[PDB]
Structures are given as structure tokens and as C-alpha cells.
């Protein structure tokens, strides 16, 4: 209509219960034939709002959105845990007082070019950058996972090829905010994002949580709750410089929690992180001149039978903390290290905290080290003989500096006595 | 049926006189509707309530028994009932305006049994938990504060019985944004708490304010404006792992500002904390692995006339930041301590600003103690770090002098901050 | 009559050409429907205004003078009017759109003091102070920036006089959240704010973007996108207590990024801030017992050719972070200094991280600084120019004055934030730790 103003369920003919993609993008094309002229008094392109009410919509067409300003909104990020529920005996269902995630509810009903499994793709090449797109307040449900020959049950793998949000094209001011995504291979993939918010999202059950692709800058993932899958990223970005990671909750099973490739002059600060494997958080690929400040890093044991031998793949000398890079900060951090000396690997291996595999004028201060085999002994820096002069003050007593003293500035934590 | 609702079209009954009533009747209307769990992939979705901007009394507490429920209005409405019943009743025509706005529900319940107060209760045994609740940018207000037998004028107790939202079951995913609540004895209380956010928010003049109790995993407090009273809390959380309490702004006048027991591996980092009193932070029966960093302290004297001779009961010895339990983390706070050294309690003690009462392999490092003397500014002599002889084998570093530090070197690992000087 | 409004649902008037004599007819409505203080324990609960996407011109100012009013829209609409305007115009009707959007107010107000060019003024006397008016999800576009005398071309001035949201009078527990502006030479001025809140919000091509005057307390600014213009702030306070400045993301062109005024007991803290000039931060005129912890700082040179020779008129002696006064605390920043030895001013000097200018007892520890000598050079195309230059960290070392120690500045403890050499300081009065080396 005139003001913009769109309701999937009063889109006439359209049916969002059994096609809701097809809803979308019809009203897409309403937008499109409407706002034609991109500068008639000053305006004339200024985008569109719309609203899913909470129901279950199911997506068989993938949304093509194409126009800056489009505002897509519901009233609940809905998330339940499926995984949970998919481990409950069958038999046991019926008394279950509800089974499926709720919300504004998108059933990603797509077959796995992993954009053609999206349910949202954004792009639109050209001039200027697609702007100011913002997803807002609603669920995103991939409803399954399926075997992938890796031997788990199928609802335990992680794997459908399905997309909740993903972003092809260059982009500037986009942002997800109040977000549910749940049993998502990727919940939400952006690629060349400038000046990106993703503001607290609830984006859980899913392989990967929040990947930055390409390249980008100035953006910022603030205060999400992020719980991803063994072979998956948590909150994973490459070749971004200047981006903010704060005040986000990140709890397992995700193969890391950060994980930086080319990333330079950025902050991952004030983070809590809890994970069940080793490879915490990756600097990784030339990651430099970046603040890794303030956070809370637990590494525990998986409690849940059923992930009870799912893991990473990584060991025990990986780190908590790995940096591959130049110049990086890693101030006032909190490791929290509780592992069982018969689950260490490989077997007899000391756990490393924090490891410096490469890279030059590092800079590691003022970090404590709590080890417990449920004290434990660990190497707090591990200095690898390929990076160099870097500083290690009050991270750790003689003995948990592992590190050439020759080419390494060292000041052991005072002891005890 | 397309599952929203609005409280002031829905048929039966009032939201004027009585909204809860109202949104007990739009929740029946909800579960009539979604009886079954697995229909098409789907079934209960759950619904959404807007309250416009109005003034609501709710008389009937509200059940939440149902998950993705979303209860929203369009105004958090605060004003500060506390300056308005302290300003002279025939001032009060004079006044633009007296009462709290916005999307207002108005708390007229009688005294709890503490739930039975609670405007919103949210409450389902069984499986699963429930899930994905929502309280969106309204306003609760418990209208007035009453006599509690001791003592000062009625509206200055911060007693009334009444709580805003308390949750009573083992919930996940729940998400209370962009409230205002004012004049509750209990703003917010969620006890079996999981991967709950509570998020830029308003909650003030209530006697406590954010409650996380029984237990709990993987919570976040952020964002929020906080104010609670003297016998109460601001931010207080028990046995919970896994917690972020970060971005807060918390002003007085709680009992502390964060208090936490048996509370685990959790952070609270980088807040504003404000209190007429000390033990602002608190980290109680066994406290352990948590992070406290780079939060700015200001512990100064109340200055407003109807509170100025009220407290928390706590002496001058017992610390800015409290701690009992192990393996902590305290690293670069700033701590403002802003006494009158002639109402040091108790007389010629020495104020001490960061105290490890019990537990091992505490880290404090790079804290900045500023102390000053002004009357209700000279430089104050303080303990920066009070070590008792019940805690041990910690390491204390850059956060004060030789003096300023008080603890046995012999179990301590203790350097002080470098002199100036050669 | 519910005390909800949309703009598109107005009886009289018309919000595409003067949507600001729309909203204050509807403030009228509200102020005559809800003209008694105390009936049935409330009576002046307030509104919400609706704006759906569109392009709204705004002729009249609006004045808000009740409490608890909320306006509100569907989209923050930003996009980059200062790219648009260095493209060639010929180009223009090639490009997918021009203007912001969402749902956009059009300042159509002729140049200002200031308060009469703002788009909204909110404004009451007496008490109670004005509460909880609440700005959510919108767009405010001051559409053209014009000649001033300084050279530029008008687009580049950042100068119009006009303001997005003007807050005159004292007052609490405002919100301002999820907003684009863009195009303003003021996007948001509050004065006497208590217990106020700037959150998340996109605040950018703004001579000045947030500033608190006058006074206040208990506030914060939070979460926002912030970019300012050379001769304006992007983050600036006077005379606050009590303030927090977390997880900002202020980018290039402010003269400085947060700036402080006689601020105490305030803590700006786990921000990235970017610059293209010196004095990124600054605590001036008795700035005391504030906190400035880990903090991400990049000073660079600007590497887009339209303001490729404007700067903010400071040199590289005046410090990325400058502080005059009393018993702040900096702690566990990280500083990137990258620039081009042959364009440090003056001419040889080292350049210096972090200066105390005045006061006593200032606490600076574990920062680390890294300094590297670059050449950006400079293109023509935005968005490119920056993502190149923050991921360039191909270079040779550049010395620097990791703390410099102004003899009027005394008493302060400075550890590890920078080896011997590094710290220009007076031994005898100043405790001073080297950063061990090697
Ligand atoms: O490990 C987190 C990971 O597992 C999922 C289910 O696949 O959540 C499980 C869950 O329980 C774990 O945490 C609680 C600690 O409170 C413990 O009792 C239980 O034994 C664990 O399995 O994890 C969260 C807390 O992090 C709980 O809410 C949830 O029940 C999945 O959602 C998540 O990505
Ligand atoms: O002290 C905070 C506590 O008191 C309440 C009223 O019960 O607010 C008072 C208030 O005023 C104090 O701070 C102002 C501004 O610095 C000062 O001028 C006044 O003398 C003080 O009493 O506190 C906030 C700021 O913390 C002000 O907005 C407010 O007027 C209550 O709201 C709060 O919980």
C-alpha cells in the first residue's frame, strides 16, 4: 500500500502458512513497481516494513531482496531447543508440552551454491551498496538435521544445507537485532559488510552461528547469545579491520568460539566464552594489531551422553587462545581450564592456555590461569620458536612461560613462597 | 487468530480496571486456539499482546504458563515517584505531571508467598521448559511504597509486597528489553534461569531491582539503568555459571550493586557502579573463577535530605569490593572513595576498598584506588587490599602501596606499586 | 483515543510536505484529551507516534513538551549522502538510489541559536523535568551540507545549521535508540540530561554527532555507529558525573572521538575508535577520576581524496589520548599509529600516544602501543580507500612518545606502556615502570 506498510498474513492471494518466500517476494515486487523513481521531491526509494505476526510459516522459495531499506520484523525470536527434544525417546512426546520453536516462525522448507540454500539471500551489484537493510525480532527454523554418514543420530549432526540470512553483495548499515535462529547449517553468512550491527540474537542449534566473509570493516557483533556446532564457527570473520565483538554470551559446542582470519585492528573484548574442545579463540592467517581483552574463557568437558565423544578434532597443545600475527594485545583475560588428565590429548600432554605460533610484538599482560583436573599443571604461554619478540608480563609463573628467553620479554607472575 | 492481540480491543473485560483479567482471558484465548503441538511441522507458536500508551490497573495477577509469548508496549514511562512523594503535597496541582506514563500497568495487588504479589507470573512444571517469553518496553509500577513497621514516612520504605515479573520455573531463552519498572518492593525475579537476557532496561526507586535465583547457566544483565533501596539489591544473582553482567549503569541506593552467591566462572566487567555504602560488590559462599574487571566504583555520601541518615548497616572495614571464594580475577577497576572522615565507621579505622574475607589463588592486579576526604577535597589514606588471615595464596599486584596493601607476604604474592622516584 | 498515531492516518495536513505541523497537531490532540494530572491514579500516561517508511519533509519544528511521548518508525535508512556527493552529478540517475529512506524526516528548517534549526526541540520548564520521551528506529536527513567560506565543496562542509533532535531543558531517563542520522550538522544535542540513554543508533556524516551539555549524570552511550566531521565531535561531554561510554564504534572524520569537558567519575571503556587525526581522545578542564580502559585506538591518514589535505588543525605532538586532570585511571588500551613519517607535523618531531598535559595522580597501565611508518597513499573511490588501509599492516617501525609527561602534569604512576625511551616523563616525581625488553 501506500505508507509501506506490509502483513504476510493480509498479502492478498498469498498463503505464508504453506509458501511464505513466495508471500515476500510478491510483496517485493509491489515495493519495486511502486517506488520507481530514485529522486522525485527529494525521495522516492525510501523502502518498506514488513511484519510477520507470531504463526508457523513455511518457506518453499528462497526471499530475493534486492532494495535498500527493507525492514523484514516479527514479534518473537521463538527459539526452543530442538536438539533437546529430538533426544527425548519418541514415545516421550506426547506429554511434551510443546515441541517445535515458536515466534514469528520462518520453516526453512529449502533443499541444500550453499545461497541457494538460504532462506533470505541479499544481493544487488552496482551503485551505491544495498544499505540499511534490518532483519528484526523473528525466527529462522531449519527444522532438521539429516545424516551426513559421520555416524551420529541425524538430529545430532549439524548438517542441512540450509541458510538463514545470507548476504552476497557488498553492504553498508545493515543489521539483525533480537533474532531466533535454530538447526541452521549457517544461521546468518555476510559477505563485504561495512558498518554492520548484529545486536543481541538468540542464534543457537546451529553448525555456524555468524560468519563474515570476504572482507569488511567498522562492524560490530554485540551482545548475542551463540551456540554453535563441532565442525562450525561460533562467531567467525576474515579480512575485517576495525570490528567490535562485545558483551556476547557464547556457549558449546561450536568448533571455536573466534575465529579470525586476516583480521587486523579489531577488539574481542568483554566476551564470555564457553566451550567443550580446545581452539577457543583463532587469530589466525596474518590476524594483527587486535585488543583480545577482558573475556571470560571456560574450557570444560561436553556433560550430555549424546555428544559424549564429538569433538573438534584439535588437542590439547592447540591453546584456548591461538594467535598467528603481528602486534596483537591480549590484556586482563580470565582461562578457566577444567579437564580430566584421561581426556587430555594426546595422552601425557601438558594443556596450553595461550599460544603464539607466529608473528612478532605480541604483547600478553596481566592474565590468571585456573587449572583443575575434576589444581592441574598448564602451560600458560607457549611461545613457538617462529614468533618473536613478543612480551609476557604477568601471565603466568617461569614455569608456565614456555617461550626463548633470549628473543622474548618475560616477567613471571611473582609466587607464592 | 493471526495470533496478536491488543489489550484495549480485546472484547471482554476492561484494561482500565482491570488488565489482568484481560490478558488471562487473550492467554486462554491462545491455548483454546493451539491446542496441538505437532501439526504441519508446527502448532503453538504462541502470540503477541500490545498494550498501548494508558494507564492499566491489573487486579487480577497475570499467568504465563504458555512459551513465545510476547508482551509489549510503546513506553518504559518513568518518573520519579520518590522526588514526587518527597515534594509537599501542595506543591503537587502546581506539577505537570505526578505519576509514571507510558504503557502503564499499574500493580494493584495486595501483600504476598512472594509470587502471589507478582503482576506477571510466568510459572509451568513439566517438559520442556518454558521458553522464549518476551517483556517488551512497558511500564510496571507499584504506585506507592507503605509503612513497614519501622519506620519513616511510607513512601520512603521501598516496602510494598508487590513484584513486577516473577518467574517462577525453569525457564530458557527468555528476554525481558526496554522496561521501565518504579515503585516495586521486587522489579524483575527469575529463579532457574538459562540463557536469559536481560536488556537495556529502566529499573529504579524498587526496592530490589534484578533477582536471579535458585540457579542458573549462560545469563546476561546489559545495558541497564539501575536503582534499588537500602535493604535491597541492584543486581544479585545465586549459584548461577556462566553469567555476563556488563554495560550496566547502576546508581544508588541498593545494599550493594552486584551481590552474588555461589555464583561461578561468570564476569562482571566494565559497569558503572554508584553507591552511598559500602559493599557495593559482593562475592559470597564460595564465589569462585569469576572476572571483575574495568568497572569504574564510586562510593560517595547520600545527599538527599529524606535518606540522609539511612544506610545498609555496613562499616568503613567492610570493603568496596567483598570477596569469599576462590580463583577470582579482579583486574583494572577504578575504585573513587569519597568519605567524611569524621563519620569513618568505626571511628579511626582506615576504609578498605577491595577485602578477600576467604579463599585461595584470588588475582587482583592493576586496580586504581583514589581516596578523598569532603565533608556530607584532601587525599584520604586507604587499604587498597585487605587480605584476612582466612584467604591465602593470592597474588596481589599494581593495586596499591606496601601500606596500602595489608596482608601476610609470607602465603601472599604480593608487589606492590612501583614509588615514584629512583 | 488508544493514544496511538500514524502520520499517514492524520486527518489534516500532509506528512510527505511538512510533517512537523502533522506531529504537533497530534501533540495537541494528546495535550487536550489528556489534560489532568491525577484521575484514577494516573492521567497524563502520554503517546506513540508512528512514522511508516517514507520520505516526510519537515517545514515547521517540532516541540515536544509532555512527557513519555514516543516516536517511533520502520527503518533507520542510512546510506552514504557523502559518497553520493562526490560522485560526478552527471552520474546520478545511473546509480540504484540517492537519498536515505526508511522512515525519513527531511529537515526542511532554514539555519538556526542552533535549538531553532532542530528538526525536534524538546522543551519544558518547571518540574518535574521532562521524562522518558523515547526516539526509536528512525531516520533524520539534514539533505545537503553548504558553502561556508572554508575552501571545501559545499557537500564536504559538513555545515547547515541544522539539528536532528535538540534536547533544551533538564531531563530523565530519555531514550534514543536504534536512529539513523545523517547530513546534520548537529544529529543530537541533550542538555541537563539525567539517567539518559543513546543506544544503538547509527549516527554518521554529522558535523557533530552526540554531545551532552550544560550538565548531567548517570547516563550512557552505548552500542552506537558513530562518524563525524573535522571541525565537530563525535562523542562529547561537559560536566557529567556518572557517565558510560561502552562498545562504540566511532569511525572516521570527528576531529576527535569522545571529548570530555569537566567529566568526573565516568568511564570510557571497550570502544573502537578510529581517527584520521591526533587528539582521538580528550579530557580537558578538570577531567578527573575517570576510567579509559580497553579501548581499540587507530590513528591513520585519511585515504579518500575529497578530504585528503583537511584535517582537524592539531599536530602529532598533541597526543591520541590527552589528559588534564585529577586520578584517571588508563588502563589495558591498545594504540595503532600508522602513518607516513614525511607527513608528521612538525616537521621530525616523534609523535606521542598518550599526553598529561595537567594534574596530578593519573594511573596509566599496561597499554600497548604500536607504531608503524605507511604510506596510504589516497584513491578516489570510499569504500575501497578504507577497507584497504585498515587491513594494510605491511610496514617498518616508526618511534614514538608512547607517554608523554607535561611538567605542569605530576605524581602519576605510569607502567608498562612503553619502554624508557618511550615515557618522557620526571623520574623524580612520577613512578614510572618500563615495559620490560629484550
Ligand atoms: O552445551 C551447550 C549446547 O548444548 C545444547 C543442546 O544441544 O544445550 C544444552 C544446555 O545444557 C547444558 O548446560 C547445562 C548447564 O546449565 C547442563 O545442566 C547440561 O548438562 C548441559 O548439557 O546448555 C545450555 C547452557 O549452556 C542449557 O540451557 C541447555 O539445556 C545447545 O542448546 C547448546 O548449543
Ligand atoms: O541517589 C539515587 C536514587 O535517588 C533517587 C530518588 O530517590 O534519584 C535521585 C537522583 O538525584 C541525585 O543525583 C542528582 C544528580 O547528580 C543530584 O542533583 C541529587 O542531589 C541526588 O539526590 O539520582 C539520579 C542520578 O543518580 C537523578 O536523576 C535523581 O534526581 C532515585 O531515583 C535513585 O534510585
Given at each position: 500500500?501506500?505508507?509501506?506498510?506490509?502483513?504476510?498474513?493480509?498479502?492478498?492471494?498469498?498463503?505464508?502458512?504453506?509458501?511464505?518466500?513466495e508471500?515476500?517476494?510478491?510483496?517485493?515486487?509491489?515495493?519495486?513497481?511502486?517506488?520507481?523513481?530514485?529522486?522525485?521531491?527529494?525521495?522516492?526509494?525510501?523502502?518498506?516494513?514488513?511484519?510477520?505476526?507470531?504463526?508457523?510459516?513455511?518457506?518453499?522459495?528462497?526471499?530475493?531482496?534486492?532494495?535498500?531499506?527493507?525492514?523484514?520484523?516479527?514479534?518473537?525470536?521463538?527459539?526452543?531447543?530442538?536438539?533437546?527434544?529430538?533426544?527425548?525417546?519418541?514415545?516421550?512426546?506426547?506429554?511434551?508440552?510443546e515441541?517445535?520453536?515458536?515466534?514469528?516462525?520462518?520453516?526453512?522448507?529449502?533443499?541444500?551454491?550453499?545461497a541457494?540454500?538460504?532462506?533470505?539471500?541479499?544481493?544487488?551489484?552496482?551503485?551505491?551498496?544495498?544499505?540499511?537493510?534490518?532483519?528484526?525480532?523473528?525466527?529462522?527454523?531449519?527444522?532438521?538435521?539429516?545424516?551426513?554418514?559421520?555416524?551420529?543420530?541425524?538430529?545430532?549432526?549439524?548438517?542441512?544445507?540450509?541458510?538463514?540470512?545470507?548476504?552476497?553483495?557488498?553492504?553498508?548499515?545493515?543489521?539483525?537485532?533480537?533474532?531466533?535462529?535454530?538447526?541452521?547449517?549457517?544461521?546468518?553468512?555476510?559477505?563485504?559488510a561495512?558498518?554492520?550491527?548484529?545486536?543481541?540474537?538468540?542464534?543457537?542449534?546451529?553448525?555456524?552461528?555468524?560468519?563474515?566473509?570476504?572482507?569488511?570493516?567498522?562492524?560490530?557483533?554485540?551482545?548475542?547469545?551463540?551456540?554453535?556446532?563441532?565442525?562450525?564457527?561460533?562467531?567467525?570473520?576474515?579480512?575485517?579491520?576495525?570490528?567490535?565483538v562485545?558483551?556476547?554470551?557464547?556457549?558449546?559446542?561450536?568448533?571455536?568460539?573466534?575465529?579470525?582470519?586476516?583480521?587486523?585492528?579489531?577488539?574481542?573484548?568483554?566476551?564470555?566464552?564457553?566451550?567443550?574442545?580446545?581452539?577457543?579463540?583463532?587469530?589466525?592467517?596474518?590476524?594483527?594489531?587486535?585488543?583480545?581483552?577482558?573475556?571470560?574463557?571456560?574450557?570444560?568437558?561436553?556433560?550430555?551422553?549424546?555428544?559424549?565423544?564429538?569433538?573438534?578434532?584439535?588437542?590439547?597443545?592447540?591453546?584456548?587462545?591461538?594467535?598467528?600475527?603481528?602486534?596483537?594485545?591480549?590484556?586482563?583475560?580470565?582461562?578457566?581450564?577444567?579437564?580430566?588428565?584421561?581426556?587430555?590429548?594426546?595422552?601425557?600432554?601438558?594443556?596450553?592456555?595461550?599460544?603464539?605460533?607466529?608473528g612478532?610484538?605480541?604483547?600478553?599482560?596481566?592474565?590468571?590461569?585456573?587449572?583443575?583436573?575434576?589444581?592441574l599443571?598448564?602451560?600458560?604461554?607457549?611461545?613457538?620458536?617462529?614468533?618473536?619478540?613478543?612480551?609476557?608480563?604477568?601471565?603466568?609463573?617461569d614455569?608456565?612461560?614456555?617461550?626463548?628467553?633470549?628473543?622474548?620479554?618475560?616477567?613471571?607472575?611473582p609466587?607464592?613462597?
Amino acid at each position: 500500500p501506500s505508507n509501506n506498510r506490509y502483513d504476510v498474513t493480509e498479502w492478498p492471494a498469498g498463503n505464508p502458512a504453506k509458501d511464505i518466500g513466495e508471500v515476500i517476494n510478491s510483496i517485493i515486487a509491489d515495493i519495486k513497481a511502486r517506488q520507481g523513481a530514485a529522486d522525485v521531491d527529494d525521495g522516492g526509494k525510501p523502502g518498506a516494513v514488513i511484519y510477520l505476526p507470531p504463526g508457523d510459516y513455511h518457506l518453499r522459495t528462497q526471499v530475493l531482496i534486492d532494495i535498500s531499506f527493507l525492514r523484514i520484523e516479527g514479534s518473537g525470536h521463538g527459539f526452543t531447543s530442538s536438539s533437546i527434544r529430538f533426544n527425548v525417546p519418541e514415545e516421550e512426546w506426547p506429554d511434551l508440552h510443546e515441541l517445535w520453536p515458536g515466534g514469528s516462525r520462518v520453516i526453512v522448507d529449502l533443499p541444500a551454491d550453499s545461497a541457494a540454500g538460504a532462506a533470505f539471500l541479499v544481493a544487488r551489484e552496482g551503485s551505491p551498496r544495498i544499505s540499511s537493510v534490518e532483519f528484526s525480532n523473528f525466527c529462522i527454523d531449519g527444522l532438521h538435521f539429516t545424516a551426513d554418514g559421520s555416524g551420529r543420530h541425524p538430529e545430532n549432526t549439524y548438517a542441512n544445507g540450509k541458510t538463514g540470512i545470507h548476504v552476497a553483495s557488498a553492504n553498508d548499515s545493515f543489521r539483525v537485532t533480537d533474532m531466533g535462529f535454530v538447526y541452521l547449517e549457517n544461521a546468518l553468512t555476510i559477505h563485504k559488510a561495512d558498518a554492520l550491527s548484529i545486536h543481541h540474537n538468540f542464534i543457537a542449534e546451529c553448525g555456524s552461528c555468524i560468519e563474515l566473509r570476504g572482507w569488511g570493516q567498522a562492524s560490530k557483533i554485540t551482545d548475542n547469545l551463540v551456540g554453535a556446532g563441532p565442525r562450525g564457527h561460533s562467531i567467525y570473520a576474515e579480512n575485517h579491520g576495525g570490528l567490535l565483538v562485545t558483551a556476547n554470551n557464547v556457549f558449546p559446542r561450536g568448533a571455536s568460539s573466534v575465529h579470525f582470519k586476516g583480521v587486523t585492528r579489531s577488539s574481542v573484548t568483554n566476551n564470555r566464552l564457553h566451550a567443550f574442545y580446545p581452539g577457543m579463540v583463532r587469530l589466525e592467517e596474518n590476524s594483527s594489531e587486535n585488543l583480545v581483552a577482558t573475556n571470560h574463557f571456560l574450557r570444560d568437558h561436553e556433560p550430555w551422553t549424546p555428544f559424549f565423544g564429538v569433538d573438534n578434532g584439535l588437542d590439547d597443545l592447540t591453546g584456548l587462545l591461538s594467535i598467528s600475527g603481528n602486534n596483537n594485545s591480549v590484556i586482563g583475560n580470565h582461562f578457566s581450564e577444567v579437564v580430566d588428565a584421561n581426556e587430555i590429548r594426546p595422552e601425557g600432554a601438558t594443556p596450553v592456555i595461550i599460544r603464539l605460533t607466529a608473528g612478532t610484538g605480541n604483547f600478553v599482560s596481566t592474565n590468571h590461569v585456573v587449572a583443575m583436573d575434576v589444581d592441574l599443571a598448564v602451560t600458560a604461554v607457549l611461545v613457538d620458536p617462529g614468533s618473536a619478540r613478543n612480551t609476557i608480563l604477568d601471565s603466568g609463573s617461569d614455569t608456565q612461560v614456555v617461550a626463548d628467553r633470549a628473543v622474548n620479554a618475560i616477567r613471571a607472575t611473582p609466587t607464592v613462597g
